[PDB]
């Protein structure tokens, strides 16, 4: 599950972990086995223009179940009407740009994660890697094991 | 009826650097103070109150400053969308009343 | 965005009084739920205060009947007027909109310090 974080916010992504980025967008369970790394892609995706493409999620209805997708276009609310026919009050919209540029220190440079996460039910696992290919000795009385 | 003074009028600055606006009283406002960003076409919006502290979320590239009679709100690397108007609103006697300024547009390029 | 922060921290000798007051951005507060919580430096966390959408509040024990929380909702802001603050209220203070059930707290402040003289 790869995506793109604020420098700052990376602290976020831990088991049960509570704030923002981990509670209304991408929220990973207490229990979960797996690892994330993440790059300060300080370079990779930036542009003096504002590398802002990704807009974050700061206004969700209700805290999140692990690994929810919440893509969505709405308006977060107070009142009756959205702003459709309202203006000022209750006119929320829940993706804000991320605005990264150069100038931005360190804490804002935009940091690529990627989160791997193994299930193991039912596992009929297709998916090692120990083939030891050691080099075949010859000649002498030696313990070999060929392919079991 | 204390009477404050914003300064400069107007501010057109290159992209990428900093942005320093100072608004100046004409008495003791102490740390009681509160900046508004009305971007053209909705309500203002408050961005940062009192002598210094960062407003929740904003983005740090905000910075208010001052005390006493002479404050200052500072920004660290406008943004595009940053375009708008500020006002320095103080409350040192709250119960209801509120004393507003001039406002000052801000620019890029 | 949708926020809160706070103001009025700083230092006042003990038993004097000080009020501190959390305006928001974005999202509304006459109708919604507000809590005032704080934490002494270093220490853990105490709900100090709440008030509804209708103005039945709420205070913790430790500041019962010495603290009122009020709002102007016109202007879209909160207020909590504090009185004889004695040796314990030496807390950091944080305002957050809390729905409960439906969400858990969310949205809190940098924080303000208010201590005493000593």
């Known amino acids: 599950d790869s995506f793109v974080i604020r420098g700052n916010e990376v602290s976020q992504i831990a088991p049960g972990q509570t704030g923002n980025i981990a509670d209304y967008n991408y929220k990973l369970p207490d229990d979960f086995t797996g690892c994330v790394i993440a790059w300060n892609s300080n370079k990779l995706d930036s542009k003096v223009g504002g590398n802002y493409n990704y807009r974050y999620r700061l206004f969700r209805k209700s805290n999140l179940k692990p690994f929810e997708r919440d893509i969505s276009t709405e308006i977060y609310q107070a009142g009756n009407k959205p702003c459709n026919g309202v203006a000022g009050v209750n006119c929320y919209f829940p993706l804000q740009s991320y605005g990264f540029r150069p100038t931005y220190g360190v804490g804002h440079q935009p940091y690529r994660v990627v989160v791997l996460s193994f299930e193991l039910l039912h596992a009929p696992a297709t998916v090692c890697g120990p083939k030891k290919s050691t080099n075949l000795v010859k000649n002498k009385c030696v313990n070999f094991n060929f392919n079991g | 009826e204390i009477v404050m003074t914003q300064s400069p009028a107007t501010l057109s600055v290159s992209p990428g650097e900093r942005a320093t606006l100072s608004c100046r009283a004409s008495q003791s406002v102490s740390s009681d103070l509160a900046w508004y960003q009305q971007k053209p076409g909705q309500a203002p919006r408050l961005l940062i109150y009192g002598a210094s502290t960062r407003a929740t979320g904003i983005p740090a590239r905000f910075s208010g400053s001052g005390s006493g009679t002479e404050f200052t709100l500072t920004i660290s690397s406008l943004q595009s969308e940053d375009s708008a108007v500020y006002y320095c609103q103080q409350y040192n006697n709250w119960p209801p009343g509120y004393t507003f300024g001039q406002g000052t547009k801000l620019e890029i390029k | 965005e949708v926020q809160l922060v706070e103001s009025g921290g700083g230092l006042v000798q003990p038993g004097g009084s000080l009020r501190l007051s959390c305006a928001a951005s974005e999202i509304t507060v006459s109708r919604n739920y507000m809590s005032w919580v704080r934490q002494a430096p270093g220490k853990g966390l105490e709900w100090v205060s709440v008030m509804f959408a209708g103005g039945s509040t709420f205070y913790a024990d430790s500041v019962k009947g010495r603290f009122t929380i009020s709002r102007d909702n016109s202007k879209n802001t909160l207020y909590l007027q504090m009185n004889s603050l004695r040796a314990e209220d030496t807390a950091v203070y944080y305002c957050?909109?809390?729905?409960?059930?439906?969400?858990?707290?969310?949205?809190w402040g940098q924080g303000t310090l208010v201590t005493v003289s000593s």
């Open positions: 957050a909109r809390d729905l409960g059930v439906v969400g858990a707290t969310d949205y």
